[PDB]
Amino acid sequence: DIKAENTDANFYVCPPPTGATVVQFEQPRRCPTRPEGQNYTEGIAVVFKENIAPYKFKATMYYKDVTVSQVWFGHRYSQFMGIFEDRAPVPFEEVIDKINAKGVCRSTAKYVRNNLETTAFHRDDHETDMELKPANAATRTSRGWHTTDLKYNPSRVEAFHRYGTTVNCIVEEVDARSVYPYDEFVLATGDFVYMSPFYGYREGSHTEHTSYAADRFKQVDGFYARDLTTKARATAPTTRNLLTTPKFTVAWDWVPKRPSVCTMTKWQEVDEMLRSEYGGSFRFSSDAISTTFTTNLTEYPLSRVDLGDCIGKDARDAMDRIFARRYNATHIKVGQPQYYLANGGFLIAYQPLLSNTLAELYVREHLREQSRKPPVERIKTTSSIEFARLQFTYNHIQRHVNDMLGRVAIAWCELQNHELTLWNEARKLNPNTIASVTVGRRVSARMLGDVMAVSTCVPVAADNVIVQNSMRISSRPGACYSRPLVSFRYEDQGPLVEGQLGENNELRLTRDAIEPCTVGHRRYFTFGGGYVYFEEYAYSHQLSRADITTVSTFIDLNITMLEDHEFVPLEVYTRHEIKDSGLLDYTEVQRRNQLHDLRFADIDTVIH
Amino acid sequence: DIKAENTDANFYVCPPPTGATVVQFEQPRRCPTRPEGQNYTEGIAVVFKENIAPYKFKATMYYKDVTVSQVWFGHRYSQFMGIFEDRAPVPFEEVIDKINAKGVCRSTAKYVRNNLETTAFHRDDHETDMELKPANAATRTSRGWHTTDLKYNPSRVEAFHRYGTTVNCIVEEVDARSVYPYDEFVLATGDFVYMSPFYGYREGSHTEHTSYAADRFKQVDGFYARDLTTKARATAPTTRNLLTTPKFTVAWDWVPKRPSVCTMTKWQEVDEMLRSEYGGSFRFSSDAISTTFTTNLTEYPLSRVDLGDCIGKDARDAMDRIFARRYNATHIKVGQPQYYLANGGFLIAYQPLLSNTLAELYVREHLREQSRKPPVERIKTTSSIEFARLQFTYNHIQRHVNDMLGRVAIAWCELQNHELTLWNEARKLNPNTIASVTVGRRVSARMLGDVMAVSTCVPVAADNVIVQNSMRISSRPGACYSRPLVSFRYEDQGPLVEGQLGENNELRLTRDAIEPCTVGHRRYFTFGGGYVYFEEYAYSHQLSRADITTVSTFIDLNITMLEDHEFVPLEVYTRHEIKDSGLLDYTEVQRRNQLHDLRFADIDTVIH
Amino acid sequence: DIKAENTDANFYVCPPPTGATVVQFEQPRRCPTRPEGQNYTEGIAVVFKENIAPYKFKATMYYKDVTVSQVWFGHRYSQFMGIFEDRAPVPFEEVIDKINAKGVCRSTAKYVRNNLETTAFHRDDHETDMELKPANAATRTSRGWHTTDLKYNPSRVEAFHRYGTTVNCIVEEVDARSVYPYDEFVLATGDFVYMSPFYGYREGSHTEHTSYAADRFKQVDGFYARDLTTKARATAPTTRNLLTTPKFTVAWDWVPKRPSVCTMTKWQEVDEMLRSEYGGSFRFSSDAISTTFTTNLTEYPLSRVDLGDCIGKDARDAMDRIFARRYNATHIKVGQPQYYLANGGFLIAYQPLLSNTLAELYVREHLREQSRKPPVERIKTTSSIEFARLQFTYNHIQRHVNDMLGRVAIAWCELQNHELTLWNEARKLNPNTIASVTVGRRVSARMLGDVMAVSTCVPVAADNVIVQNSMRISSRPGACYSRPLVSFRYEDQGPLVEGQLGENNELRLTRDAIEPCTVGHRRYFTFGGGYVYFEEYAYSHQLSRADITTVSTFIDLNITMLEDHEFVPLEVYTRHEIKDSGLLDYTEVQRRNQLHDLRFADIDTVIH
Ligand SMILES: *[C@@H]1O[C@H](CO)[C@@H](O[C@@H]2O[C@H](CO)[C@@H](O)[C@H](O)[C@H]2NC(C)=O)[C@H](O)[C@H]1NC(C)=O
Ligand SMILES: *[C@@H]1O[C@H](CO)[C@@H](O[C@@H]2O[C@H](CO)[C@@H](O)[C@H](O)[C@H]2NC(C)=O)[C@H](O)[C@H]1NC(C)=O
Ligand SMILES: *[C@@H]1O[C@H](CO)[C@@H](O[C@@H]2O[C@H](CO)[C@@H](O)[C@H](O)[C@H]2NC(C)=O)[C@H](O)[C@H]1NC(C)=O
Ligand SMILES: *[C@@H]1O[C@H](CO)[C@@H](O[C@@H]2O[C@H](CO)[C@@H](O)[C@H](O)[C@H]2NC(C)=O)[C@H](O)[C@H]1NC(C)=O
Ligand SMILES: *[C@@H]1O[C@H](CO)[C@@H](O[C@@H]2O[C@H](CO)[C@@H](O)[C@H](O)[C@H]2NC(C)=O)[C@H](O)[C@H]1NC(C)=O
Ligand SMILES: *[C@@H]1O[C@H](CO)[C@@H](O[C@@H]2O[C@H](CO)[C@@H](O)[C@H](O)[C@H]2NC(C)=O)[C@H](O)[C@H]1NC(C)=O
Ligand SMILES: *[C@@H]1O[C@H](CO)[C@@H](O)[C@H](O)[C@H]1NC(C)=O
Ligand SMILES: *[C@@H]1O[C@H](CO)[C@@H](O)[C@H](O)[C@H]1NC(C)=O
Ligand SMILES: *[C@@H]1O[C@H](CO)[C@@H](O)[C@H](O)[C@H]1NC(C)=O
Ligand SMILES: [Cl-]
Ligand SMILES: [Cl-]
Ligand SMILES: [Cl-]
């Protein structure tokens, strides 16, 4: 008769289970809890870095340009037999009396050179106090004053060597720069001075390093400087230093050391700096600069910092300013400011805050912020902050992803527990399909009260199943079968079995499934890889799944992967671009300069 | 009789609910929608940075080495009483006529020094034009030419001071470098020249800065240079400059200023630069360099840029080249190129594109790209691009994570809405278990049509429950109980209640649960923390959950957390390694050099 | 009679479906698998960078300070007519014999200058061997020795020019520095020396670059140096070099070249460096420094590296040390160390490891690590490692997110497949509501065996529905209706239809829904946007959803988005701060220094 038109499936005989095998459903699981969560402290921060910048100040130089030339005369020319140039230090006396008082300078220089007291005379005449005319126009320089525009040369005497002295008294304002430990400094002209710029008398600054004779240094109390250009006196009374070097004299207003230098520099003021304790370490996170710093749980004492006067003062001046701008009505200062040393060598000044609304915790926390209180050297700061920003970025994504998937993991678990209650009611309705989906294999099931009995199924080949043409019971008219009759064999050569088709291609051995006849009885029955269609209890034809419209119970979820991505090296200016930005390269110049003999002369030839 | 073998659970009496308390299920919720999503513009980009590189050019120096020595003679030695060295500037005349025309130089130097016209004679003889032999072998230098290899010294005259003049005419090619604002420059020898390298006559370049006398400068139109080595003339006619300084004369081919300098440098050409509007700002993202830039919605006018000629020209030359390589058949140029200033001080040249397939929007968008059109100073570029790459990385992960969890949130909601339809049918089947799971507490339920009536349950201690030995009804044989009989008391000292065991350890008060007897009736019934097993309506024994095979209805989901991770500071070369890479340190050298008197002499002793 | 109190809903007439339209549920889907996952190799790494640091060594200088002064006398002063200073190279002879043997130096200098053999006499007397007293106190300098503290000046002779010679024999220890390609070097004093620091005799180091005469260089085998301060000889016998320049003589112990220089520097030792193959490239990831490097699958041969002796030696010395500390009992070395060149110009030395527990794969993998084995130039290393840390951070988050959502996608799919089994049983119970939720529209459904027949519903306006007051059947007492009677019309002007209220506001056309009467029959029935309440089969009143307590079947899931975040540019020290940290700026100084004539004199005036 009729075999299956679709052979791409299996049939199963499903005998009733005895109770030899019994199973139960797993009870609901204890669901994970959301973590308590990191507690953040609100605070104002000031981050500090290593000071790499030198101390800078204003200074004035006083010297003279002593030039002695030697000229020869012939027919009819002249030729310098030599030009001797030297720098003569202007003694304290002339500066205060001739310059700063009148604006004039001497036409004579007198100084110590190579262990002899030499004396020069401008124009080889005698003393004459000469006004200090401003220096010629030159951009990006300080002001300057000279007394003579010209070099003096001897009158012509044929076939003779004559000498001419020139004296130009020079006063220029210069910048001075000193580096740690501030025991010597340099001028804009390139001259070194081997003394601390804080060497004076007032207070204990006479302890500073000097390498010159005591008589080279003098300090004037109440020194009223007079602008050599506007001829104006100074309304302010400044203390003024004067050191006389072998080549010059340097004047500058003296100032105390500590309130003027610092081995630390204020870097970032942070309005909202959240501190969380995490792992026996502190995390100072700033949303505004995307930076997270890591420190120990103990403060760093500023008494361990060499020359760190500016730290306390700068940290307070900012915090007060910020507190008054942002928190002057919303929070409360909890304790004095704190200082922690962060990885990378950053010093963090921190002022814990507490919300007005939660003021009931002040004491509880005030005690805590006092636990961290501190019971000389130099801090070294890295040049790259990128690690602390990697930290910040990573922590933030990490915290978010873990939070969210954590929530999903819980919601997933709750839903599994809840749906068990549906599975429990479903299993009574259709023990076979439920048990099969639960276990993972087509089995036969039957409730034994509260547990579920399970027996295995037996496969039957598709070509071994024949469906009978009719569904009407001839013996007792007025009654028919609900589902079609079938015949089959387990093995290919075996005998036929009288059976009835059940759901899911199950072959039932009892033909008991009986219903009273009806009109227009049209049914589709699952049969093989498709359906068999009956019309009024008579076989019509078979058909395929594709012939019937499909609708889904499934809820779509469209997850795609985040693709691989390659980060290439990328620099704004490469290390070489930075080197080449310098206008002159000392090394390059010296290398050429010192090749000059080799390139253009002969250092390996003696004449006799 | 028989108590519970497992006392680790609860029993509940569940009286029928009246209707005093009624509940309903929450209707389906409005599910969230997926956001519309950022629209990206396809475009070609050229990113620009601050130009930190100086202008560089070729120059030739012309000077002479005037050396006058003084020697003394004894028995039987010689000793230099002095050596006077000077650099004599070669006048325009000799360069064009003797050098560039023949290759020879004069044996005499004549120049201005200390306000006197001096004159030198090589070998103290008279004029003699001397060929310019190439300079000696020296690596990594330019070429050079000198006329004399030797210094001339006077013939021996016992007990006498004699003088000897030496003249070496020198011509070397040198590199020149100038920095913004290009009003002076330096040579490779270290010499400064206080004039703009664009100072000439042609066009309006006579306006450039100079600080020398007019007669120091001359320019030759059509200057045919002659290679002093190969003796070859220049086939090309160049305009040539000549400035005469107090120490030398510098020659170099003159060129216009604007098409030769720029305060900006092309940094990255970007094939695909996506621009999205987001937050009243633009985002220029480049997948290729992993960089996202942030700019305002308005272009930056190039008319605000000082010396930015190269920007327009370079930006176009690249975009055209790229368009022709990649988009010459796929897209359409939309408007002229645009320029936006990005955070960090990056100038972005941008050319919007439009896909051929979507050409119907040209006008619609062409109008938009014209809205941004612009209706002198210096741009400052940071050295660190890392922020814009942090930006890029973060945005990309952010966009992906939000997209995906967004989808989950929707799919989760849809599934909750869908399953309600199962809960609705389940509640009819087992109002007690469904109501209990829904509320959260063991209650008793009953449908009142479309709402659900709920009463509370009553707990009964485990030790207060006894299960009867039989399940057979003695009064009417041929009928038995479905579930075992029980007896219990609410309070420990109270009286016994005739009852029947229901599902989930419920104690039913009516013993109505009756079924017709059967053969082989074996049932497991939930009882306490385990099951009670009956066989043919007679008590067999109790047992524990562990005694029965467990199968799960639950679908596993294995979510683990992304662990904490610490980013340490890491530098390739530390700030100090970069300092020390320099071969000579000017500061270190000067500090030693200027200590020399102090270390090896006496600057504090006068002899008389 | 009674209309709906809540008009905010719809009613539907749901006629039985014929079988004209039939649907089926979508079968379970094939669920995605978890990917196999990247396999990591455990290994020890040593990362190498470009060596930017010069070669540094100790050197001694030997020269003399020859000073000849000229003084004039008057009434009653003195004035230097000139001071000639020169540096005289100390010949090999005096250093070994007078200095290194006794500690004394000559009072005479004899040397070659400007092609003449000059000779100087200290104090203008004759030879006298003078002890070398230590140099004066000066911080941060090396030691030094001079013979004379004073400059000698001639005795006073009125109206006469007299000359005085001074000789100071000087010996100072200096540091020397040379850069690639190491063919010349510099001293701390700033002097250049144009010879390779490896120029000697022993081995083939006579091939090094020199630019001086052969007689300028001498090497002493077995040179026992004597400390000029402690008067102590050297117990060690060193080979010693002596080069004599025109200005000085430099001595230094000679050493071989290759084992002393390198164009590469060890940067990071990495304990655990995981290597994975991914995309025809290798990924070397280090958890400890948060860095992921990218290389080709082929080793880089060290034979392609110029002067890379240190690489092999340093890479082994560390790996052995580390292996012995960490893996001396846990893993096995697999092959000789390997070298790969990574993007950014990093050289990675790698030693693959294998866990003892998985030793069965040695051969299988030993063969593989030999496939990569290599069958001169300079490597260039970027200054920024940030890209490889971006890489690391991104990959790690990427891997985690994809893993987890991947798992969710699978678990989601499995749950959809599992719940179908519930939907299958539910549809028999309530074909109307199930079919409606499945399709998406209120339809009418009926099972046709195994498929489901579906017809559309018809909407009826709310104001068109009237609910009858009673529920009792007058004709046959002892029986009532389960759900209320209703009357309605499809169109507003149409006729009334006798009908019964079903679930979900369906209007049933057959009034068959009949139950036997009961006492206390109180029911709530869905009616419009609320319920209608009956009490003992008689209409009571209507009410709203809000009047009844709501309980939810829904499981909450609380997903929030990860917000936008802006990364601002942030630098620790800006490019300008780094420039200004230098104490002296060569360029700044030279610019001032060379302005001095222009500012303070006149270079444009001839006197006659
Ligand atoms: C505390 O913070 C608030 C923040 O707005 C300040 O409010 C402003 O205060 C200034 C001057 O104090 C007023 O001119 C402004 O009009 C205020 N802003 C408004 C009204 O929006 C407040 O002043 C701060 N308190 C102190 C003492 O500085
Ligand atoms: C926080 O305190 C710890 C103390 O455990 C410091 O650890 C030091 O780490 C360095 C580097 O490895 C070691 O050389 C020291 O010996 C450690 N100190 C001690 C006491 O063991 C750590 O440096 C502190 N953090 C900061 C930022 O200073
Ligand atoms: C536009 O882009 C396409 C991209 O492939 C170019 O195609 C190549 O064109 C060159 C020369 O124009 C041919 O030699 C190649 O064989 C082409 N590549 C192939 C066939 O794969 C195209 O030429 C471009 N158009 C212009 C005008 O440059
Ligand atoms: C985009 O336009 C805004 C205008 O709101 C610019 O904002 C400036 O921000 C700086 C730094 O805080 C302020 O000093 C200026 O006063 C602001 N300008 C104005 C007009 O308020 C912003 O700089 C622009 N973006 C770029 C990259 O230039
Ligand atoms: C191999 O590694 C283990 C790691 O602990 C080493 O164990 C330590 O070894 C040292 C000296 O070898 C002992 O002083 C320590 O007490 C050991 N640590 C303990 C016991 O915790 C082991 O020694 C290593 N092997 C070699 C040969 O170095
Ligand atoms: C890995 O091998 C590839 C070979 O395909 C190298 O690719 C080179 O890439 C540069 C830059 O684009 C090109 O200039 C070369 O022409 C390419 N080489 C070849 C043979 O095509 C790549 O450089 C290698 N990786 C490393 C780190 O060296
Ligand atoms: C899911 O999205 C991917 C790409 O985003 C698309 O290819 C696929 O067709 C989508 N499928 C569904 C069912 O949304
Ligand atoms: C889930 O994964 C974790 C680690 O990935 C493992 O410990 C656990 O046994 C796994 N459980 C299941 C049910 O997959
Ligand atoms: C979910 O969380 C958000 C914020 O985290 C909160 O506003 C909302 O009330 C929460 N809702 C539930 C049902 O958890
Ligand atoms: Cl953080
Ligand atoms: Cl982006
Ligand atoms: Cl990785």
For residue C349, what are the β-bridge partners? C46, C339
Rounded to an integer, what distance in angstroms lies between the CA atom of residue B192 and that of residue C520? 114
Query: What angle, 0 to 180 degrees and rounded to 10, lies between the N-to-C axes of helices A386-429 and B431-439?
Result: 160
Rounded to an integer, what distance in angstroms lies between the CA atom of residue C392 and that of residue C289? 10
Rounded to an integer, what distance in angstroms lies between the CA atom of residue C313 and that of residue A358? 63
Rounded to an integer, what distance in angstroms lies between the CA atom of residue A584 and that of residue B192? 10
User: CB distance from C594 to chain B under 8 Å?
Assistant: yes
- C278 CB neighbours in chain A (<8 A) are 564
Q: Which atom of ligand 7 is nearest to the CA of A558?
A: 1
How many independent structural domains does chain A possess?
Answer: 5
Q: Are residues A139 and A188 in the same domain?
A: yes
CB contact under 8 A, C558 and A407: yes
Q: Are residues C106 and C188 in the same domain?
A: yes
Burial of B606 (0-12, 13-18, 19+ CB in 10 A): exposed
Rounded to an integer, what distance in angstroms lies between the CA atom of residue C244 and that of residue C238? 19
- Indicate the residue type of A391: Q
Q: Which of B86, B503, B562 sits opposite A398 (nearest CB)?
A: B562
Cβ atoms of A423 and B603 closer than 8 Å: no
Q: Which of A343, A384, A448 sits opposite B571 (nearest CB)?
A: A384
Binding-site residues, ligand 9, Cβ < 6 A:
C 556, 558, 560
Q: Which residue, B136, B22, A369, is CA-closest to C523? A: B22
Burial of C226 (0-12, 13-18, 19+ CB in 10 A): middle
Rounded to an integer, what distance in angstroms lies between the CA atom of residue A559 and that of residue C408? 9
User: CB distance from A189 to chain C under 8 Å?
Assistant: yes
Helix ranges (DSSP H) in C430-546: 431-439
- B183 CB neighbours in chain C (<8 A) are none
- DSSP letters for C185-204: EEETTS-EE-B-TT-SSSTT
Sign of CA dihedral A511, A515, A516, A522: negative
Q: Are residues A33 and A61 in the same domain?
A: no
CB contact under 8 A, B553 and A416: yes
CB contact under 8 A, C418 and A433: no
CB contact under 8 A, C398 and A564: yes
Q: Which residue, A87, A484, A381, A357, is CA-closest to A247? A: A87
Cβ atoms of C239 and C219 closer than 8 Å: yes
Sign of CA dihedral C325, C330, C331, C332: positive
- B79 CB neighbours in chain C (<8 A) are 68, 118-121, 165
First vs last Cα of chain A: how many Å apart? 136
**Exposure of C268 in the CB half-sphere (CA atoms within 13 A):** 26
Cβ atoms of A567 and C389 closer than 8 Å: no
Alpha-carbon distance B352 to nearest alpha carbon in chain A (angstroms): 24
Query: Which of A:108-127 have CB within 8 Å of B?
Result: 112, 115-117
Q: Are residues A434 and A492 in the same domain?
A: no
Cβ atoms of C285 and C399 closer than 8 Å: no
Rounded to an integer, what distance in angstroms lies between the CA atom of residue B376 and that of residue B112? 42
Helix ranges (DSSP H) in A277-385: 309-322, 362-371
Total number of residues shown for chain A? 608
Rounded to an integer, what distance in angstroms lies between the CA atom of residue B425 and that of residue A144? 102
Query: What angle, 0 to 180 degrees and rounded to 10, lies between the N-to-C axes of helices C386-429 and B386-429?
Result: 10
CB contact under 8 A, A406 and B211: no
Query: What angle, 0 to 180 degrees and rounded to 10, lies between the N-to-C axes of helices C386-429 and A386-429?
Result: 10
Testing the interface with C: which of B278, B291, B421, B579 to mutate, by most C Cβ within 10 A? B421
Query: What angle, 0 to 180 degrees and rounded to 10, lies between the N-to-C axes of helices A431-439 and A386-429?
Result: 150
User: CB distance from A433 to chain C under 8 Å?
Assistant: yes
User: CB distance from B191 to chain C under 8 Å?
Assistant: yes
Rounded to an integer, what distance in angstroms lies between the CA atom of residue C557 and that of residue C268? 46
Tokens standing for B228? 């002093």
Rounded to an integer, what distance in angstroms lies between the CA atom of residue A110 and that of residue B483? 130
Alpha-carbon distances of C353 from A436, C266, C287, C333, C341, rounded to whole Å: 48, 21, 17, 5, 20
Q: Are residues C309 and C406 in the same domain?
A: no
Q: What is the dihedral of CA B123, B126, B132, B133, to 10 degrees?
A: -40
Q: Which of B149, B384, B584 sits opposite A586 (nearest CB)?
A: B584
| Parallel, antiparallel or unpaired: strands A291-295 and A282-286 | antiparallel
Tokens standing for B272? 């695909």
Alpha-carbon distance B541 to nearest alpha carbon in chain C (angstroms): 34
According to DSSP, residue B38 is labeled: P
Sign of CA dihedral B587, B593, B598, B599: positive
* 3-class secondary-structure state, position B539: strand
CATH number, domain of A45, equals 2.30.29.100
Block residue for tokens 């955070």: B343
User: CB distance from A492 to chain C under 8 Å?
Assistant: no
Burial letters for A235-251: b for 16+ Cβ neighbours within 10 Å, e otherwise? eeeeebbbbbbbbbbbb
Q: Are residues B569 and B451 in the same domain?
A: no
Closest chain C CA to residue B450 = C525
Rounded to an integer, what distance in angstroms lies between the CA atom of residue A193 and that of residue A176? 10
Phi-psi region of B168 (alpha: psi -120 to 50; beta: other; left: phi over 0): beta
User: CB distance from C77 to chain B under 8 Å?
Assistant: no
A-C CB pairs within 8 A amount to 318
Rounded to an integer, what distance in angstroms lies between the CA atom of residue C542 and that of residue C551? 21
Q: Are residues C5 and C88 in the same domain?
A: no
Q: Which of C565, C569, C605 sits opposite B394 (nearest CB)?
A: C565
Q: Which residue, C409, A85, A383, is CA-closest to B579? A: A383
Rounded to an integer, what distance in angstroms lies between the CA atom of residue C414 and that of residue C394? 30
CB contact under 8 A, C449 and A114: no
Block residue for tokens 């003339």: B233
CATH number, domain of B448, equals 1.20.5.1890
Question: Which ligand is in closest contact with the Cα of C297?
Answer: 6
Can you say how many angstroms the Cα of residue A336 is from the centroid of all Cα atoms in its chain?
28
* Residue C72 dihedral angles phi and psi, to the nearest 5°: -115, 155
Rounded to an integer, what distance in angstroms lies between the CA atom of residue C133 and that of residue C385? 52
Q: What is the dihedral of CA B118, B124, B128, B131, to 10 degrees?
A: -90
Burial of A467 (0-12, 13-18, 19+ CB in 10 A): buried
Closest chain B CA to residue C526 = B450
CB contact under 8 A, C86 and B81: no
CB contact under 8 A, A598 and B574: no
Q: What is the dihedral of CA C428, C429, C431, C437, to 10 degrees?
A: -110
* 3-class secondary-structure state, position A235: coil
CB contact under 8 A, C79 and A566: no
Rounded to an integer, what distance in angstroms lies between the CA atom of residue C276 and that of residue B318? 38
- Indicate the residue type of C470: S
User: For residue C436, what are the domain limits?
Assistant: 17-39+382-457
Q: For residue A181, is the peptide bond before it cis, meaning its omega torsion is within 30 degrees of 0?
A: yes
- A564 CB neighbours in chain C (<8 A) are 278-279, 395, 398
- Indicate the residue type of B496: L
Burial of B567 (0-12, 13-18, 19+ CB in 10 A): buried
Rounded to an integer, what distance in angstroms lies between the CA atom of residue A388 and that of residue A399? 16
Sign of CA dihedral C8, C13, C14, C17: negative
Rounded to an integer, what distance in angstroms lies between the CA atom of residue A331 and that of residue A43? 10
Q: Which of C112, C115, C573 sits opposite A52 (nearest CB)?
A: C573
CA A395 to ligand 8 center in whole angstroms: 25
Rounded to an integer, what distance in angstroms lies between the CA atom of residue C67 and that of residue A289? 62
A416 lines ligand 2 (CB under 6 A): no
Tokens standing for C152? 């000698």
Cβ atoms of C222 and C237 closer than 8 Å: yes
Rounded to an integer, what distance in angstroms lies between the CA atom of residue A503 and that of residue A432? 10
Tokens standing for A286? 């700033």
User: CB distance from C562 to chain A under 8 Å?
Assistant: yes
| Parallel, antiparallel or unpaired: strands A11-13 and A506-508 | parallel
Rounded to an integer, what distance in angstroms lies between the CA atom of residue B420 and that of residue C314? 69
CATH number, domain of B484, equals 2.30.30.1230
For residue C445, what are the β-bridge partners? C454
Q: Are residues B449 and B485 in the same domain?
A: no
Q: Are residues B67 and B133 in the same domain?
A: yes
Residue in A47, A292, A296, A341 to alter for ligand 2 test, most ligand atoms within 8 A of Cβ: A296
Which of B549, B574, B595 corresponds to the end of one domain? Answer: B549
Q: Are residues A207 and A89 in the same domain?
A: yes
| Helices and strands (H, E) in chain A, number of each type | 9, 39
* 3-class secondary-structure state, position A412: helix
- Indicate the residue type of C25: F
CB contact under 8 A, C483 and B81: no
* 3-class secondary-structure state, position A319: helix
Tokens standing for C251? 């001595």
According to DSSP, residue A304 is labeled: G
Q: What is the dihedral of CA B86, B87, B89, B90, to 10 degrees?
A: 100
Question: Which ligand is in closest contact with the Cα of A377?
Answer: 2
* 3-class secondary-structure state, position A498: strand
* Residue B224 dihedral angles phi and psi, to the nearest 5°: -90, 95
Rounded to an integer, what distance in angstroms lies between the CA atom of residue A428 and that of residue A416? 19
3-state SS of A93-155 is: HHHHHHHHHHCEECCEEEEEECCEEEEEEHHHCCCCCEECEECCCCCCCCCEEECCCCCCCCC
Rounded to an integer, what distance in angstroms lies between the CA atom of residue A117 and that of residue C84? 17
Alpha-carbon distances of A32 from A38, A408, B40, C558, rounded to whole Å: 18, 11, 41, 15
CA angle at A145 for the pair A142 and A151, rounded to the nearest 5°: 125
Rounded to an integer, what distance in angstroms lies between the CA atom of residue A240 and that of residue A218? 8
Cβ atoms of B531 and B8 closer than 8 Å: no
Rounded to an integer, what distance in angstroms lies between the CA atom of residue C401 and that of residue B397? 9
Which of B402, B436, B457 corresponds to the end of one domain? Answer: B457
3-state SS of B324-372 is: HHHHCCCEEECCCCEEEEECCCEEEEEEEEEEHHHHHHHHHHHHHHHHC
Closest chain B CA to residue C155 = B608
* Nearest protein CA to atom 1 of ligand 8, as residue: B558
CB contact under 8 A, A70 and C82: yes
Sign of CA dihedral C326, C332, C336, C341: negative
Tokens standing for C260? 């002393």
Diameter over CA atoms, chain C: 163
Residues having C-beta closer than 5 Å to ion ligand 10: A 285, 292, 395
Q: Which residue, A17, A29, A6, is CA-closest to A416? A: A29
Q: Which residue, C146, C245, C137, is CA-closest to C191? A: C245
Q: For residue B35, is the peptide bond before it cis, meaning its omega torsion is within 30 degrees of 0?
A: no
Q: Are residues B284 and B251 in the same domain?
A: no
If residue B386 lies in a helix (H) or strand (E), which one and from where to where?
helix B386-429
Q: Which of B70, B115, B384 sits opposite A151 (nearest CB)?
A: B115
For residue C453, what are the β-bridge partners? C22, C446
- Indicate the residue type of C320: D
* Residue C306 dihedral angles phi and psi, to the nearest 5°: -80, 125
* Residue A297 dihedral angles phi and psi, to the nearest 5°: -85, 0
Q: Which of B213, B402, B572 sits opposite C604 (nearest CB)?
A: B213
Q: Using only C-alpha atoms, what is the Rg of chain C? A: 51
Q: Are residues B216 and B290 in the same domain?
A: no
- Indicate the residue type of C294: T
B330 lines ligand 3 (CB under 6 A): no
Rounded to an integer, what distance in angstroms lies between the CA atom of residue B90 and that of residue B251? 11
**Exposure of A411 in the CB half-sphere (CA atoms within 13 A):** 22
Cβ atoms of C40 and C274 closer than 8 Å: yes
First vs last Cα of chain C: how many Å apart? 136
Which of A549, A567, A594 corresponds to the end of one domain? Answer: A549
| Helices and strands (H, E) in chain C, number of each type | 9, 39
Alpha-carbon distances of C12 from B28, B544, C432, C443, C457, rounded to whole Å: 19, 52, 12, 9, 6
According to DSSP, residue C97 is labeled: I
Determination technique used: X-ray
Binding-site residues, ligand 8, Cβ < 6 A:
B 556, 558, 560
Question: Which ligand is in closest contact with the Cα of C564?
Answer: 11
